[PDB]
Write a protein that binds this ligand. Sequence first.
Ligand SMILES: Nc1cc(Br)cnc1N
Length: 328
Amino acid sequence: GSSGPVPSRARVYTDVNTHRPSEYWDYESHVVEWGNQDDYQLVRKLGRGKYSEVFEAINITNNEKVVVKILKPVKKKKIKREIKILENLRGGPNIITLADIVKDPVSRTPALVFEHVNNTDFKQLYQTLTDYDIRFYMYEILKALDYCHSMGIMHRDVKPHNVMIDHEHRKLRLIDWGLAEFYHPGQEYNVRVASRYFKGPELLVDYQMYDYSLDMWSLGCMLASMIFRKEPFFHGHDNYDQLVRIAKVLGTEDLYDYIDKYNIELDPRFNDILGRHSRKRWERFVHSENQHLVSPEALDFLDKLLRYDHQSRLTAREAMEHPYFYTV
Ligand SMILES: Nc1cc(Br)cnc1N
């Protein structure tokens, strides 16, 4: 056996970028126009990322609250990609609105201006959600994902911190498109994306020909953590250990079937840590503290998202048609 990995392509929206003019997806050729940041007054720091600083601000022209993301310009091509994707998706359902692109006159630092969302941190909100609330918000994220997938884009960083929820107004926004990328059938992508707990098995086994289905694995991780009140659901201490946490639930038999279907070469680092694990029933995770959030429908939907085989997972459109969402 010396044939290399078996190629794969998305089951939906496969050729959406192929049939569009290069302007749409060639972000390296996109010309960015930077406005004057003097129209925005910074109020408070909301967070600090690896390559950004996020601030709550006021637009002085209309006295409205906005969010200003000041980017550390470490990679210009990466800045061009995020802007192009945000402009392509601008106005889509539950997608954060890019309101402006500006630079401070003195620093010349690239900054993105977004609509403000009055978010409740997940570490305080998720404990208060009812069975209905989880169904409702999951449907809202699905509307965002089916939209961006239809637009030939994969988010590649779906996690609670990238889902802003204004619970009082039942408004949800999918944010931080900095890791997002255009889907091109047959393209080999960098596997060093998403946050450890939400990384799909495809990333962990170094299978580069992934697609939109990566976002469906991440969504499943969020769902499992919400219905079982276990944060994170798969608690790896590193990227290799992350796959072992997954294998302790999904079992090692189905993992070997996955890597055999795509002729994947498993890294030798997995040899002494993987072990042998039985497939666990989803009902094993039900306890007194979470049983009011779990149902046969919830478990059937979860089982259809958390599969090693990226091709076998529900697409966002199939997911929207699941019985779990008949009440929304
Ligand atoms: N933290 C935050 C980011 C964005 Br973008 C919009 N609203 C927020 N609350």
